[PDB]
Amino acid sequence: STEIPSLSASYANSFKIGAAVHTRMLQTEGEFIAKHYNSVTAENQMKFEEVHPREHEYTFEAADEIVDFAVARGIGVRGHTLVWHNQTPAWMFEDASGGTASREMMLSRLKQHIDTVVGRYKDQIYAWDVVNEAIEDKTDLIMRDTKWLRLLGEDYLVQAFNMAHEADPNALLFYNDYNETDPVKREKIYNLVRSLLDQGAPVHGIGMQGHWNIHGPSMDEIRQAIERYASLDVQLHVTELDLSVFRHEDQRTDLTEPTAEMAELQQKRYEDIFGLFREYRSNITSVTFWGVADNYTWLDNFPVRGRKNWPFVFDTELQPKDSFWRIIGQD
Numbered sequence: 001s002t003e004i005p006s007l008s009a010s011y012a013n014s015f016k017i018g019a020a021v022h023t024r025m026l027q028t029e030g031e032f033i034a035k036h037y038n039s040v041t042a043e044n045q046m047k048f049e050e051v052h053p054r055e056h057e058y059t060f061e062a063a064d065e066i067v068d069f070a071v072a073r074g075i076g077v078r079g080h081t082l083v084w085h086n087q088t089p090a091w092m093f094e095d096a097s098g099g100t101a102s103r104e105m106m107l108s109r110l111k112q113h114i115d116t117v118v119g120r121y122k123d124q125i126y127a128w129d130v131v132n133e134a135i136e137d138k139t140d141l142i143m144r145d146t147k148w149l150r151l152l153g154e155d156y157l158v159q160a161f162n163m164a165h166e167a168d169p170n171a172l173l174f175y176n177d178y179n180e181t182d183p184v185k186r187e188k189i190y191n192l193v194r195s196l197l198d199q200g201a202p203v204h205g206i207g208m209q210g211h212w213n214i215h216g217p218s219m220d221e222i223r224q225a226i227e228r229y230a231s232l233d234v235q236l237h238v239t240e241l242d243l244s245v246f247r248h249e250d251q252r253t254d255l256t257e258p259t260a261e262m263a264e265l266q267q268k269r270y271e272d273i274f275g276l277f278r279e280y281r282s283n284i285t286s287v288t289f290w291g292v293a294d295n296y297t298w299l300d301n302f303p304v305r306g307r308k309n310w311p312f313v314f315d316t317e318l319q320p321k322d323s324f325w326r327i328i329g330q331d
């Protein structure tokens with residue numbers, strides 16, 4: 001579209017290159033997106049609260065527009081989170097008295113939601129994040145204490161995957177999570193999917209969120225996670241990749257642009273990462289960035305409200321950053 005090669009095309013024989021999108025960027029960044037991405041994920045417009053605000057009311061307008069945009073351009077679409085403890089309306093977990101919904105209610109409601117959401121795009125979504133972030137970060141805790149686990153039951157994951165698989169048996173069903181490289185959590189995610197496959201659950205892939213930063217995880221840590229998850233004979237997708245220039249609970253806030261140090265480390269960081277992905281392209285079939293360009297990122301408001309970040313290879317003006325050129329695939 002100017003002087004830079006299509007990022008997605010440079011990986012056409014390696015793995016998809018995708019981005020998290022929102023309908024608001026389609027009428028302005030649609031061309032840029034179609035040029036550089038052969039996959040898209042709705043950042044939020046396909047989550048439970050966004051498509052099923054009320055029990056008897058579905059609002060698919062936004063998600064439908066994203067799908068029409070992609071499908072008409074040969075662009076793949078990943079469905080994000082059907083079951084997650086966040087961005088899920090309260091009515092789903094409540095009964096008529098405002099009390100907690102029963103197991104039977106949870107099941108019938110989850111069934112209807114899945115059939116409607118997954119069934120709507122039957123054969124159009126190549127991959128669905130069936131369950132998102134079910135494992136704890138606490139060293140001594142395996143399963144995250146959520147309303148799905150409490151009101152539906154310990155088999156809520158098996159339930160979710162089975163219902164989604166019936167709504168569309170051709171879509172790849174993924175289990176998505178973050179801090180997937182941390183040794184302790186890695187083994188928990190590994191044992192989860194492992195146990196699921198053993199139960200006969202239709203889980204075909206593990207989603208490595210990739211919410212990393214210019215300081216970690218290291219190459220070796222990512223390498224072990226890759227090989228570990230891959231050994232399960234499932235596909236691996238990097239679903240929400242971003243490299244924050246800030247660390248956890250970062251105290252810095254006077255930055256209008258990355259420092260020279262940040263820019264240098266991020267550039268080298270992206271190079272090493274995609275170098276690693278190419279090495280494992282046999283296991284990785286899709287790599288999605290949680291955003292299009294630095295002009296917008298969910299990180300600008302999380303975990304610090306109003307703190308600008310620049311975690312992508314494209315800058316605020318949609319121009320390729322130095323990291324872009326170091327990430328161009330070999331096809």
Ligand SMILES: O[C@@H]1[C@@H](O)[C@H](NCc2ccc(Oc3ccccc3)cc2)C=C[C@H]1O
Nearest residue numbers: 043044080081132133178209211240298303
């Ligand atoms: O849907 C994605 C989601 O999967 C992602 N998880 C990453 C993540 C998970 C937990 C987390 O931890 C906290 C959550 C709330 C409050 C404090 C910490 C921080 C990031 C975030 C972006 C969303 O668009």
